[model samples]
Target: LFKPTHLPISKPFHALLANILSEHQAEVVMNFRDSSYSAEDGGFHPVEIALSQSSDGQWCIEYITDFAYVFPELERCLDFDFQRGDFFTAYHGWNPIVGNRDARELYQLWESNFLAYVATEAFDDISLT
Candidate 1:
């Protein structure tokens, strides 16, 4: 449901987005209007980007879901083995934490929580010193 937008991102903002993408190990690519019928939900896999200006005049990147397409492999990286649709459906449950902060701050929180989850998952092997 992405609406076409014509607002150009400033060079500085583009650089910032570039830096974020680089740090997160993602990149931009053109959409080819291809279809992945095997994909859950039977939706065509199309690459898209979105941006919007905040009330404070700050441009917030709107297509945060870009990460899912950029890093579908993250499904395995996560503790659960999630298919693409399952991954996003489940991941969206964390929107409160994911959407409530700046990118860096959100990443740090995700990292901390993920580490804790990993430790807990392996708790059977770790004994108190």
Candidate 2:
């Protein structure tokens, strides 16, 4: 019931994405705020937003970032995915499984320097028309 409607010849989110890609080196794409995402490999995914609880036991939103994707349960591949900027790790190095801690770390870094990573507008869904 919450799907975004298209006004005639309107620039939909996907269309905006295409235009943004053409003019900018990086873009920020997000679905509507309230939605659930699936982890690619049926493994534990990380939480994107973390909060702090005070002595009174009230919670507060402390951090949020775009690195919420559960790192897929990894398997070594013979080659690197150059198209998606993916690279190969050493034959016997850190396992690539992503967990809660990894997700938190990713979120912290992204939130701390989001502007550097995004090339276009910084408006959130609430601010976008």
Candidate 3:
């Protein structure tokens, strides 16, 4: 659902991500597009950087999906919605979490939780897709 955006990310967002990732890991290559095909749907996928650059610019993130991990989850997300047409699908339903459904909070959890896991070696050498 995420599409390439041309808008530049704010410095605060950059600094926050850098602080979260540590300088050693903060060199976020320009990758991953953020788009909402629908307000109810979104996605992050592997793409040719040039193609991505041609899309929108803001809301782009550095990490691409870890397909080894994400494909299964994506399938589950699809299944959660009865294998919705690609455009109508919502990625967050893959394995529905039991809690508040605030988007910002969910994203923060995703960032912090995964980073904590990576720091603990939950996924060794897990890089961008």
Candidate 4:
């Protein structure tokens, strides 16, 4: 079993993200260098996060995708849109379906960064503790 944990990030990655976001919306693929991930056991898979500018001239998360085990339930609403600083309730253009709720929670857990989310997926088990 695996438990989600925080992973270190590189400054270059942040710089690349900033440059991409400055131009326009962007999606950054995230990966981890670990056996749990490299071995492939349905526990971890590639994920991408999108960044975009809001009408208020603020940068924010546009959407997030988990290729590992994406449920069709919320596929339609995967691209939940909202400004970066906006409150969760303030999110726009998202359905209130059950699947959407799961998607919302998943995205919420990744508020820190894409790498953090990947850590959670790569090692999400209580036994390790």
Which structure among the candidates has the greatest TM-score? 4
Judging by lDDT, tell me the better candidate of 1 and 3: 1
TM-score, prediction 4: 0.33
Q: Which digits, one per residue and each the tens of the lDDT, describe model 2 over residues 10-109?
A: 2242344344334543313222221333445332212232233345644333222232332453233221221222223334233222333443343344
Q: Select the stronger candidate by TM-score from 1 and 4.
A: 4
Measured by lDDT, the strongest candidate is 4
Candidate 1 wrongly placed segments (more than 4 Å):
1-47, 54-58, 66-92, 98-129
TM-score of each: 0.24, 0.20, 0.31, 0.33
Candidate 2 C-alpha error for residue 47, in Å = 9.1
User: Taking the tens digit of each residue's C-alpha lDDT, what string does model 1 give over 1-129?
Assistant: 112222222444355344534464431322212333223443322323334445664544444232223213322112111111121223434232222333335344444543443334422221111
Give per-residue CA lDDT, model 4, range 1-129, as digits (tens).
111112222444455455544454322332232335432243444444555444565544444343333322212223333323221222344344233445446455544455564445553421100
User: Considering TM-score, where higher is better, how would the candidates rank from best to worst?
Assistant: 4, 3, 1, 2
Error of 3 at 92 (Å): 6.3
Local error of candidate 1 at residue 117 (angstroms) = 28
- lDDT of model 4 at residue 35? 35
Comparing 2 with 4 on lDDT, the higher-scoring candidate is 4
- Clashes (N, CA, C under 3 Å) per candidate: 0, 0, 13, 8
TM-score of 3: 0.31
Where does the lowest 10-residue lDDT sum fall in candidate 1?
Answer: 76-85
Per-residue lDDT over 7-94 for candidate 3, one digit per residue giving the tens place of the 0 to 100 score: 2223444454444344433413322222322223533332211112224443334222222113243222211111221111254544
Which residue segments of model 3 deviate by more than 4 Å?
Answer: 1-101
